[PDB]
Short mmCIF file of N, CA and C and ligand atoms in Angstrom, two decimals:
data_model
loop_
_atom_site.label_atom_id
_atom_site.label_comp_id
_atom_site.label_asym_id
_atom_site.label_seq_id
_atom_site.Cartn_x
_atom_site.Cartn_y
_atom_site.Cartn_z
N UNK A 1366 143.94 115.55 59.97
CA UNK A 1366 144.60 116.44 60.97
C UNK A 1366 145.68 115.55 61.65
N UNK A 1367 146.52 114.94 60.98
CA UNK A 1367 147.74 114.11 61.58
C UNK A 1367 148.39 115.07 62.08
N UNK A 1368 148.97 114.38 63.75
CA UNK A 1368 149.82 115.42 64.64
C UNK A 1368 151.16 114.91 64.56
N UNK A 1369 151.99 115.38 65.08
CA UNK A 1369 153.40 114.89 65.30
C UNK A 1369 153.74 114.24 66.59
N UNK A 1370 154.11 113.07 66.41
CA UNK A 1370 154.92 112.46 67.79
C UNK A 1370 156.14 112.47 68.17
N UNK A 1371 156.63 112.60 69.21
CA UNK A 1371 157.98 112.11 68.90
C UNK A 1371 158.46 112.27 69.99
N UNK A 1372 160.06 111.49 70.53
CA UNK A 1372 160.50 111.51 71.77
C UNK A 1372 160.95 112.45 72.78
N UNK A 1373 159.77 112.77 73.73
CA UNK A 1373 159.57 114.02 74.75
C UNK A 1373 160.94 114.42 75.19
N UNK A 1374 161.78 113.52 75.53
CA UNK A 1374 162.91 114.62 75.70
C UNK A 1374 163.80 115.52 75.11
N UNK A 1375 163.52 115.39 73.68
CA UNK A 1375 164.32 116.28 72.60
C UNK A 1375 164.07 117.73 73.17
N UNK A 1376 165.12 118.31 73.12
CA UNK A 1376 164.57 120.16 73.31
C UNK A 1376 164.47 120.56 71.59
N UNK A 1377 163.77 121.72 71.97
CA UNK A 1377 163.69 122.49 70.22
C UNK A 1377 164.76 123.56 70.67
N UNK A 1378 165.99 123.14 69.94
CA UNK A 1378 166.80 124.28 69.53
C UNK A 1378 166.55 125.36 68.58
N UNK A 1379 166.12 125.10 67.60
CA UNK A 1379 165.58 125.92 66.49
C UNK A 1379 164.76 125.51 65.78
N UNK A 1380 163.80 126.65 64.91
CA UNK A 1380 162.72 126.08 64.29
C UNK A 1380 161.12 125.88 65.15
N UNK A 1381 160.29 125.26 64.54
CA UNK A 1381 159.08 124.91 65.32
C UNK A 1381 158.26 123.87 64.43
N UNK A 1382 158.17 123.30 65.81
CA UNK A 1382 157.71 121.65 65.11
C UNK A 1382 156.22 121.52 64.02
N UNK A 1383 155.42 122.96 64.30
CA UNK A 1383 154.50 122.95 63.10
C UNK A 1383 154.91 122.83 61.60
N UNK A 1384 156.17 122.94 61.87
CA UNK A 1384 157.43 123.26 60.40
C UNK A 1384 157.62 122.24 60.04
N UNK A 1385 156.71 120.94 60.44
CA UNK A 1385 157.28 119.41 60.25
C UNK A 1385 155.68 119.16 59.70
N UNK A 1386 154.67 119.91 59.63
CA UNK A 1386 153.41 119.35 58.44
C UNK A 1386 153.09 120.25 57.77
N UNK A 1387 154.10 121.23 57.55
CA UNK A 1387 153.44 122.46 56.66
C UNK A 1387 153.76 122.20 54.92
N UNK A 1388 153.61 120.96 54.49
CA UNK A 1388 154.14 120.82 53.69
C UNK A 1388 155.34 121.35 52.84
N UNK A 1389 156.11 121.98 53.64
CA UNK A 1389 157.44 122.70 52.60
C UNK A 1389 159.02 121.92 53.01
N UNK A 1390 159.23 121.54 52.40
CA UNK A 1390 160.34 121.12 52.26
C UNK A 1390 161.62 121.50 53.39
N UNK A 1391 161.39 123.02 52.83
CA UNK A 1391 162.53 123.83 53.04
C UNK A 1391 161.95 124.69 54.73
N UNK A 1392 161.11 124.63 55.00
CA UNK A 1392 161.30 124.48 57.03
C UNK A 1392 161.04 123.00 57.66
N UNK A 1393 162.02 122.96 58.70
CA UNK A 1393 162.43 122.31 59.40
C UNK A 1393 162.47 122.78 61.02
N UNK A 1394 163.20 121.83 61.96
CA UNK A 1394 163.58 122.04 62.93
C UNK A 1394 164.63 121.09 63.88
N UNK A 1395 165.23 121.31 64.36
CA UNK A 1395 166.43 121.78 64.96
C UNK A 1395 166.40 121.12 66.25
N UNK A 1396 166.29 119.73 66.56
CA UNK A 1396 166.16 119.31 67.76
C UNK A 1396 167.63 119.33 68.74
N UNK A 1397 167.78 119.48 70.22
CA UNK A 1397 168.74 119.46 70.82
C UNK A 1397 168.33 117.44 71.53
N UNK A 1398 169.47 116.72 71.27
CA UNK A 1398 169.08 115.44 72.43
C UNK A 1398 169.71 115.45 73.58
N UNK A 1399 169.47 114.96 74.52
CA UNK A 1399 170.12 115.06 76.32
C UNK A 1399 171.17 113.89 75.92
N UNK A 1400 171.00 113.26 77.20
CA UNK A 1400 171.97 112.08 77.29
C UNK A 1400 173.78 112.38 77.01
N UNK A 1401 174.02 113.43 77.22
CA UNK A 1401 175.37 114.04 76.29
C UNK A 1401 175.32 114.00 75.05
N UNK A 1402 174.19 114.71 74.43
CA UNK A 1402 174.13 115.04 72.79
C UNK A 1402 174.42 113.47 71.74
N UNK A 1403 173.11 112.95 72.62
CA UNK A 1403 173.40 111.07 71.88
C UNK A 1403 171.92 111.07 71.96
N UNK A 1404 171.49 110.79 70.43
CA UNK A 1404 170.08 110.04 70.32
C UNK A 1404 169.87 108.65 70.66
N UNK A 1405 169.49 108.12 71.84
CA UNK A 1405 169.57 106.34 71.93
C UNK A 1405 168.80 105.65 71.25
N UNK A 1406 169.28 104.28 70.74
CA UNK A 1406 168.08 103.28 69.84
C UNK A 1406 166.73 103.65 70.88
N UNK A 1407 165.77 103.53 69.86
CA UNK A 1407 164.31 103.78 70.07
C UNK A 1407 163.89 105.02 70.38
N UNK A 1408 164.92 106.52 70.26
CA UNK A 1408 164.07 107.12 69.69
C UNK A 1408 163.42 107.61 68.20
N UNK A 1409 162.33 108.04 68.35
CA UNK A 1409 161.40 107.86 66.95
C UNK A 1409 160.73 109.53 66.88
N UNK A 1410 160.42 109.71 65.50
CA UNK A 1410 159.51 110.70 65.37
C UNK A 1410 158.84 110.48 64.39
N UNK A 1411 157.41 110.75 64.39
CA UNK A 1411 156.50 110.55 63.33
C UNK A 1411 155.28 110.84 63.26
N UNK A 1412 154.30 110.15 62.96
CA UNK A 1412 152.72 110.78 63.12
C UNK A 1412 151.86 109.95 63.68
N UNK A 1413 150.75 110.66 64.03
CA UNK A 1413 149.19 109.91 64.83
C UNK A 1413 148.10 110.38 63.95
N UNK A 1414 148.13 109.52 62.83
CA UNK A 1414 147.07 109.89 61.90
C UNK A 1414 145.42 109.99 62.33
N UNK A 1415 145.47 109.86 63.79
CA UNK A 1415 144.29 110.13 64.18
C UNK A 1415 142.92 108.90 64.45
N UNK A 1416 143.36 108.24 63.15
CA UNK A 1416 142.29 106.88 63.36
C UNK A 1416 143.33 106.04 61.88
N UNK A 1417 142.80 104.98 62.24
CA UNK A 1417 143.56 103.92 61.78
C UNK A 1417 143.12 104.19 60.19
N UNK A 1418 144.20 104.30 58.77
CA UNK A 1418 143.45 104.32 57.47
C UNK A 1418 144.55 103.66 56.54
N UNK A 1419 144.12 103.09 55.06
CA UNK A 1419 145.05 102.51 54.78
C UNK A 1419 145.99 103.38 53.85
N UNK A 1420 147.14 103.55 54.22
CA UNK A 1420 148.47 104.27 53.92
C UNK A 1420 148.79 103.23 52.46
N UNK A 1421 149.42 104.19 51.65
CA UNK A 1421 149.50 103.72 50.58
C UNK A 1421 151.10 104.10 50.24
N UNK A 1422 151.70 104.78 50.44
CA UNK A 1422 152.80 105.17 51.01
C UNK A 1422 153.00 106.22 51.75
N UNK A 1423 154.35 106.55 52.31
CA UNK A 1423 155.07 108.04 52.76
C UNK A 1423 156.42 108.65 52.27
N UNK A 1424 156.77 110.45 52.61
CA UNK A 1424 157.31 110.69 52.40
C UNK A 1424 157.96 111.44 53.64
N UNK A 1425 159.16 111.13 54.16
CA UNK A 1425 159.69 111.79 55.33
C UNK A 1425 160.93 112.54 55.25
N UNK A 1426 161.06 113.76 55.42
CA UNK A 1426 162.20 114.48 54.56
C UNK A 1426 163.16 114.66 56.29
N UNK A 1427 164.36 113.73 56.61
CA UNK A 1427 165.04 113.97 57.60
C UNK A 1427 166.02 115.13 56.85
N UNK A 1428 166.60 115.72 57.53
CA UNK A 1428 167.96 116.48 58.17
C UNK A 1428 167.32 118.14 57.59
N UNK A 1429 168.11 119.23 57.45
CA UNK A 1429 167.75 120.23 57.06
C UNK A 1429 168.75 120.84 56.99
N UNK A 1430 168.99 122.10 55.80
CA UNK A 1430 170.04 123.23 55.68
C UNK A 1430 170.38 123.80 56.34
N UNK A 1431 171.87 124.17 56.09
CA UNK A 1431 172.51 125.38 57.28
C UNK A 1431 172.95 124.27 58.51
N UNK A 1432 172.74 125.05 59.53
CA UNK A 1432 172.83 124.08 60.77
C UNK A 1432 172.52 122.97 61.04
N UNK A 1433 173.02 121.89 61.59
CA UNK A 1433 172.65 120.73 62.02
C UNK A 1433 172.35 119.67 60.34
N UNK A 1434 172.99 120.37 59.67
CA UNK A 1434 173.17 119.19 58.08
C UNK A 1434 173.57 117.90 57.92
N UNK A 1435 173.85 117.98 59.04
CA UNK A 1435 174.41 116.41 59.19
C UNK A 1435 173.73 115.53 60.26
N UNK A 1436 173.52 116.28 61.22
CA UNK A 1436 172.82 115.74 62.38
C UNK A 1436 171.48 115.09 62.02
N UNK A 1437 171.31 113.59 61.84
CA UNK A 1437 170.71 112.46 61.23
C UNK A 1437 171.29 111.28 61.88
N UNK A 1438 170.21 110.73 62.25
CA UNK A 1438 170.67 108.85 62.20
C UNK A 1438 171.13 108.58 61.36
N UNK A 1439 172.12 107.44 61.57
CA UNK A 1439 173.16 106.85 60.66
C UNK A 1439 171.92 105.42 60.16
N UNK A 1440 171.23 104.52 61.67
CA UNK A 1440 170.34 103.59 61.29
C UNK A 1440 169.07 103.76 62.14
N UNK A 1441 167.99 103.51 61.18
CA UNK A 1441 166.70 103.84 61.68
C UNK A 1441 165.94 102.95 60.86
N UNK A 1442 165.14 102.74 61.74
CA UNK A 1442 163.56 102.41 60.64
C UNK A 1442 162.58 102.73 60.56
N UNK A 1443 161.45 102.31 59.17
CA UNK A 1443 160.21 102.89 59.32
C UNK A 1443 159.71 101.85 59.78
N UNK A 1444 158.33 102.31 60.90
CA UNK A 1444 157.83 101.33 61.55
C UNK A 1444 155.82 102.03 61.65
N UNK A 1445 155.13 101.19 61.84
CA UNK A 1445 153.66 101.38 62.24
C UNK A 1445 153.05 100.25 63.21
N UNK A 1446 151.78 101.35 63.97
CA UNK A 1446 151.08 100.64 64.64
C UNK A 1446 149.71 100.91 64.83
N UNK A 1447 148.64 100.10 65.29
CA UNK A 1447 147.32 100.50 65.34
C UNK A 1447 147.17 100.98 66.90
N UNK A 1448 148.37 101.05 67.68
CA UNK A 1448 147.79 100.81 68.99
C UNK A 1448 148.91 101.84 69.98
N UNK A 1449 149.39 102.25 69.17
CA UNK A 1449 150.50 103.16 69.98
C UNK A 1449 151.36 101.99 71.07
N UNK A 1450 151.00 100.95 70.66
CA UNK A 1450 151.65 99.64 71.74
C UNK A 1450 152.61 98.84 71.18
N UNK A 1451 152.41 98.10 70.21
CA UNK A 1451 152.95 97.32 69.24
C UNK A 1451 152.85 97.90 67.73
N UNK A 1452 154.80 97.71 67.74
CA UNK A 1452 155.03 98.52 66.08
C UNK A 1452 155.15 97.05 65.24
N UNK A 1453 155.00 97.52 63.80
CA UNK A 1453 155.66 96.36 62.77
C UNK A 1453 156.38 97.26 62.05
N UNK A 1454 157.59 96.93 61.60
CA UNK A 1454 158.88 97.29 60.94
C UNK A 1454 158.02 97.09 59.60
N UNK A 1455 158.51 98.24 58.55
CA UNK A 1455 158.31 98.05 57.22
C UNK A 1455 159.66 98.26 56.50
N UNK A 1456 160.91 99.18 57.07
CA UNK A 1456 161.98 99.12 56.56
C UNK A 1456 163.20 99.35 57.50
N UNK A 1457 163.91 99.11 57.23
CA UNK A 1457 165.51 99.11 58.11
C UNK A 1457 166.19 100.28 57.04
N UNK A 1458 166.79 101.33 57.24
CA UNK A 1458 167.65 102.29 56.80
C UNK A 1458 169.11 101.64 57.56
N UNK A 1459 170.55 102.62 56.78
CA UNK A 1459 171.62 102.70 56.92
C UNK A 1459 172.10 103.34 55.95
N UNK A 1460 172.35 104.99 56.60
CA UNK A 1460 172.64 106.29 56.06
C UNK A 1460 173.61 106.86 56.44
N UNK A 1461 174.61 105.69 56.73
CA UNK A 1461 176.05 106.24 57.20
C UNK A 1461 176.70 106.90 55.89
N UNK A 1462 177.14 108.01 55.98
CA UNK A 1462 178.01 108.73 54.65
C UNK A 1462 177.12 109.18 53.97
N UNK A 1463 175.47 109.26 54.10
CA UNK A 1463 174.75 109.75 53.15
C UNK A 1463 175.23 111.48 52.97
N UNK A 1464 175.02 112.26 51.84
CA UNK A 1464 175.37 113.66 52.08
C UNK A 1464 174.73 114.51 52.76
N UNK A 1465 175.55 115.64 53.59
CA UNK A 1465 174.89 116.46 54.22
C UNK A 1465 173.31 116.82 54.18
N UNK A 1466 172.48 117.24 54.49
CA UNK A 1466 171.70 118.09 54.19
C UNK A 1466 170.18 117.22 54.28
N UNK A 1467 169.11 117.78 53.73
CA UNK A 1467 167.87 117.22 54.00
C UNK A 1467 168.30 115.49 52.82
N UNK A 1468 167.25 114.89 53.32
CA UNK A 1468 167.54 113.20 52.88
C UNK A 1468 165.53 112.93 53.09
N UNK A 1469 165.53 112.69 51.70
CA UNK A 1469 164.08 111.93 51.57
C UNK A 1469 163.95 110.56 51.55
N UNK A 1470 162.75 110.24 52.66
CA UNK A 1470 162.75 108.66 53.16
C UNK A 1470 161.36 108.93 52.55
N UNK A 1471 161.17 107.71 51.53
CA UNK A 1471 160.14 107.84 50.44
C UNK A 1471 159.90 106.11 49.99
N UNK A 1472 158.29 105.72 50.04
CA UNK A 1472 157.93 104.59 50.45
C UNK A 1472 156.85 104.60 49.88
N UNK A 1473 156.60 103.41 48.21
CA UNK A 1473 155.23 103.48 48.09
C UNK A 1473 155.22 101.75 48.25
N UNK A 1474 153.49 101.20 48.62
CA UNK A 1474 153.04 100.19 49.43
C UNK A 1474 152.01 99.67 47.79
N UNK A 1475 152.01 98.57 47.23
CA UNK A 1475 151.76 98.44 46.04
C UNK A 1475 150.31 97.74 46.88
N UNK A 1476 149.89 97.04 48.08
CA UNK A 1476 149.11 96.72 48.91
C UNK A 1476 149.10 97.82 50.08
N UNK A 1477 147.72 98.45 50.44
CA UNK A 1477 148.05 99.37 51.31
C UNK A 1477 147.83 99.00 52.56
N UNK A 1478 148.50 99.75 53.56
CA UNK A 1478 148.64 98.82 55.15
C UNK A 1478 148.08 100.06 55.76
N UNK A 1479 147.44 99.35 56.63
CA UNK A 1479 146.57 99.55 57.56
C UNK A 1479 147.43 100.25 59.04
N UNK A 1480 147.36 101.69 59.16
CA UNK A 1480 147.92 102.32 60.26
C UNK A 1480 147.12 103.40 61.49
N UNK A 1481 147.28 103.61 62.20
CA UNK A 1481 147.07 104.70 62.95
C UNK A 1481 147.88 105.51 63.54
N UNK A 1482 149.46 104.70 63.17
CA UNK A 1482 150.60 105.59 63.96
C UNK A 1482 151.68 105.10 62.82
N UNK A 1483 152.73 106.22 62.36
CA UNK A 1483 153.80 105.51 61.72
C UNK A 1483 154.34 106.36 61.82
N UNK A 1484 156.08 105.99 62.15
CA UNK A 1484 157.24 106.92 62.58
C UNK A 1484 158.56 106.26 62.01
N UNK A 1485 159.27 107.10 62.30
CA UNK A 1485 160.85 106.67 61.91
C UNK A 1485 161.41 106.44 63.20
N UNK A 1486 162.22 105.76 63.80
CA UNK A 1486 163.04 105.01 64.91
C UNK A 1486 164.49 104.47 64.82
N UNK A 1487 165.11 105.57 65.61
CA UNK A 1487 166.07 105.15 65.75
C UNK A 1487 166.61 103.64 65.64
N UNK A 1488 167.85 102.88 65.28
CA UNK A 1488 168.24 101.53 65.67
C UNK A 1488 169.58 101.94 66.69
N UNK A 1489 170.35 102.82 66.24
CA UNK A 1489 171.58 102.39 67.19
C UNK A 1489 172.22 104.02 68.17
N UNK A 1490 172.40 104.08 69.06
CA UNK A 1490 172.82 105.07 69.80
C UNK A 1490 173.87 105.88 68.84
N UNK A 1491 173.90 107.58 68.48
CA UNK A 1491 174.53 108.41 67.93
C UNK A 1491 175.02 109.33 68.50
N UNK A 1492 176.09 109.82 68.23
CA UNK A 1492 176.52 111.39 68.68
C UNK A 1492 175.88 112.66 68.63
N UNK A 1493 174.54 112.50 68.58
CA UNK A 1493 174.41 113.84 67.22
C UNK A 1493 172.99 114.26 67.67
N UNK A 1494 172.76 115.58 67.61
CA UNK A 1494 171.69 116.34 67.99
C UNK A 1494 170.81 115.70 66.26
N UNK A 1495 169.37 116.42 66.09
CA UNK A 1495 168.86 115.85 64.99
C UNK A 1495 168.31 117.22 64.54
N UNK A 1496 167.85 117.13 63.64
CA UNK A 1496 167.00 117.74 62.47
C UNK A 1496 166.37 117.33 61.37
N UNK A 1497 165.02 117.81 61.29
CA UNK A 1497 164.18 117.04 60.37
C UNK A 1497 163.13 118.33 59.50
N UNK A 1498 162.61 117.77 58.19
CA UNK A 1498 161.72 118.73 57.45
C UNK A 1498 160.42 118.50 57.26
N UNK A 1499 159.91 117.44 57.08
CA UNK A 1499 158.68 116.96 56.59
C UNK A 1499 158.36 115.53 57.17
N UNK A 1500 156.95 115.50 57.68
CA UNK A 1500 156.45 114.26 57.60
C UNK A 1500 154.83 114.37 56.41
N UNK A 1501 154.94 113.37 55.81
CA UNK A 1501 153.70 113.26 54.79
C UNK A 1501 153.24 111.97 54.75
N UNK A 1502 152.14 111.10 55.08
CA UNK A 1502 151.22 110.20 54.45
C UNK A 1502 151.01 110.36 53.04
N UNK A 1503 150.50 109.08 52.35
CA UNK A 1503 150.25 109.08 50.72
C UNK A 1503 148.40 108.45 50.93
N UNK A 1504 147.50 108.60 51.12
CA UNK A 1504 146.39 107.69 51.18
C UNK A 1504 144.94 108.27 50.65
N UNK A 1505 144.54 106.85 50.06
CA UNK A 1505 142.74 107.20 49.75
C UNK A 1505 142.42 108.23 49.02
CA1 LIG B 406 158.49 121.57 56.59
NA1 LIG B 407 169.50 120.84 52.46
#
């Protein structure tokens, strides 16, 4: 029963965030960001797998069709933690010019790591409202 986390001040412009574990691809949602429509480094969205298990990989489907196709971090990373306190980085992205539309962030762990929380995180301040489709764990 992994829930979704992610940074409380986003508004939901469109969509609904159950649309982010229903396994389908093709719903999404439609976040609005404050700050004058700028996501700042460190924000993140991702999951609370509930209790710590070992992840073997993931699959995270950012941006979505139609509206907001572009609206994506340019740099982000994937990151985990056991403690909702302290993250460890597993990858650094840079998706400047990637094409419009949904973008699969896809990660298998040939040793599996040990999580209770793993999200995607912003690195650098953007212009840009967001949108996202899927979060998925790979494990056990
Ligand atoms: Ca979905
Ligand atoms: Na698309």
């Amino acid at each position: 029963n992994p829930s979704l986390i992610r940074s409380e001040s986003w508004q939901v412009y469109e969509g609904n965030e159950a649309n982010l574990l229903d396994g389908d691809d093709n719903t999404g949602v439609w976040y609005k960001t404050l700050n004058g429509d700028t996501s700042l480094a460190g924000e993140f969205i991702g999951l609370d797998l509930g209790k710590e298990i070992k992840l073997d990989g993931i699959r995270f489907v950012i941006g979505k069709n139609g509206g907001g196709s572009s609206d994506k971090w340019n740099k982000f990373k994937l990151e985990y933690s056991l403690d909702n306190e302290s993250w460890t980085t597993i990858k650094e992205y840079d998706k400047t010019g990637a094409p419009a539309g949904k973008d699969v962030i896809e990660e298998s762990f040939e040793t599996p790591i040990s999580a209770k929380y793993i999200r995607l995180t912003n690195m650098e301040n953007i212009n840009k409202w967001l949108t996202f489709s899927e979060f998925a764990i790979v494990s056990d």
